[PDB]
Scaffold this active site. Structure first.
Site, PDB file in Angstrom:
ATOM      1  N   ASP A   1      34.334  32.856  24.693  1.00 60.30           N
ATOM      2  CA  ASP A   1      33.989  33.708  25.696  1.00 60.30           C
ATOM      3  C   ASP A   1      34.083  32.657  26.999  1.00 60.30           C
ATOM      4  OD1 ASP A   1      32.460  35.132  27.446  1.00 60.30           O
ATOM      5  OD2 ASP A   1      30.747  35.196  27.038  1.00 60.30           O
TER       6      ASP A   1
ATOM      7  N   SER B   1      44.859  36.772  41.113  1.00 53.49           N
ATOM      8  CA  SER B   1      45.929  38.160  40.593  1.00 53.49           C
ATOM      9  C   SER B   1      46.437  38.161  41.961  1.00 53.49           C
ATOM     10  CB  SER B   1      45.274  38.393  40.223  1.00 53.49           C
ATOM     11  OG  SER B   1      46.127  39.727  40.194  1.00 53.49           O
TER      12      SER B   1
END
Length: 330
Positions: free
Chosen positions: A35, A199
């Site tokens: 994770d 992004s």
């Protein structure tokens, strides 16, 4: 040193991935959920409340000659999906794919929430976010990656998750045969303890690319792609019959649909998520309403590039002094 381990979807939907991890002496192998959105290595154990264990493999520290109780240490964690676990702490030898750390904090669960009990395939979590998020008190502990870092050939790990198929986590090296083209690297902020990056935009299907900054985290421990409501609405608007369902808890779509791809930007580069990766199947057994793999982050407080996004790429988690993230197509 290096390590290399195969990671395998837990079910036919790729709801999560499990990676075998050797703990203790002799080794006890547990299948952990790696994770990158948390920083605790915790396991089902001989100390876990018996009614809360249902099929998981447990760690038994009393059977490990290298286990030592970390006196006074406790841990307690709550995840974005509302699940939680807590317990005490041992140090022990932990190996992943041939890479060994001695003295790793292994957080032994005394209590786990129902979501964990109900998932027989996950024996615990191995956190790979920054150690500043580790919950051990009163002495915060380091992640497996942080402990291994100085010994690694290069201070990196890579995630190469499969679509309906196994993939690989590598530690300490970049497998140049595992991706196509070049890896594009992008800046990381560690201020929230995550692999947080920005992004450069998105496209829906064969549509034109929208240049827009989208701050989010690379999180292997989250199944879906969670993005701003504007972006998500633009995606699902291209699927006839798709709608956001408050009763179901997100966007659903007719199972008869063919989904468009979704592209996200990494610098000047582009990662394409095929439409099929966005199909999470019937909302309930036998339903013709299917659950979407792209969902709104509104009310999460952060955008999450979860498995839906990451499995479309070869992803480098670069833990150099100034961390960065790399993405390549594959």
């Amino acid at each position: 040193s290096t390590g290399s381990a195969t990671t395998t979807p837990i079910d036919s939907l790729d709801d999560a991935y499990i990676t075998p991890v050797q703990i203790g002496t002799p080794a006890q192998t547990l299948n952990l959920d790696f994770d990158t959105g948390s920083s605790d290595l915790w396991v089902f154990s001989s100390e876990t409340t018996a009614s809360e264990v249902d099929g998981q493999t447990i760690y038994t520290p009393s059977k490990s000659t290298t286990a030592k109780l970390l006196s006074g240490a406790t841990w307690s964690i709550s995840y974005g999906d509302g699940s939680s676990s807590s317990g005490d702490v041992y140090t022990d030898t932990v190996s992943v794919g041939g890479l060994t750390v001695t003295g790793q904090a292994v957080e032994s669960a005394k209590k786990v929430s129902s979501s964990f009990t109900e998932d027989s395939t996950i024996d615990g979590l191995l956190g790979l976010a920054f150690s500043t998020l580790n919950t051990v008190s009163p002495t915060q502990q380091k992640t497996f990656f942080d402990n291994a870092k100085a010994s690694l050939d290069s201070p990196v790990f890579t995630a190469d998750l499969g679509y309906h198929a196994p993939g690989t986590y590598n530690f300490g090296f970049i497998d140049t045969t595992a991706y196509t083209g070049s890896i594009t690297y992008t800046a990381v902020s560690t201020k929230q303890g995550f692999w947080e990056w920005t992004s450069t935009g998105y496209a829906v299907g064969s549509g034109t690319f929208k240049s827009t900054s989208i701050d989010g985290i690379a999180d292997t421990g989250t199944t879906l792609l969670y993005l701003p409501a504007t972006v998500v609405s633009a995606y699902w608007a291209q699927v006839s019959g798709a709608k956001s369902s408050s009763s179901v808890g997100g966007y659903v779509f007719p199972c008869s649909a063919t989904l468009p791809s979704f592209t996200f930007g990494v610098g000047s580069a582009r990662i394409v998520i095929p439409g099929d990766y966005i199909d999470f199947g019937p909302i309930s057994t036998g339903s013709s309403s299917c659950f979407g793999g792209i969902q709104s982050s509104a009310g999460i407080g952060i955008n999450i590039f979860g498995d839906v996004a990451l499995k479309a790429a070869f992803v480098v988690f670069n833990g150099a002094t100034t961390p960065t993230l790399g993405f390549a197509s594959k």
